[PDB]
């Protein structure tokens, strides 16, 4: 009734980490602020012609 447990796949030795969450997006400990998304960069080299 209280905790949403998320399991870390790659745990090193052993631990459990309890955290808090709020109703807003400010109410947290860390912020992941997105910016410009994945960039489809392309090109080619005109001395071997193989793409990149």
């Amino acid at each position: 009734g209280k905790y949403r447990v998320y399991i870390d796949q790659y745990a090193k030795q052993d631990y459990f980490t309890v955290g808090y969450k709020g109703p807003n997006e400010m109410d947290a400990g860390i912020y992941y602020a997105p910016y410009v998304a994945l960039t489809p960069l392309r090109g080619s080299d005109p001395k071997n012609f193989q793409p990149v």
Binding site: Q50, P51, V52
Partner: protein, 52 residues
């Protein structure tokens, strides 16, 4: 822009796979089969063909 390569120029490598990069092949595509033909017969009208 990636390493494929040649099946090492000897029939044993070209058998199934064993390339130089990482494209390891299934195997050469079969084409057909060739065999000797049946030699022809020199008549039999030059002798006797009397049955027994």
């Amino acid at each position: 822009a990636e390493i494929g390569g040649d099946h090492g120029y000897n029939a044993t490598n070209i058998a199934a796979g064993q390339t130089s990069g990482a494209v390891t092949q299934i195997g050469p595509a079969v084409m057909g089969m060739v065999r000797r033909a049946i030699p022809n017969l020199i008549a039999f009208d030059i002798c006797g063909v009397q049955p027994m």
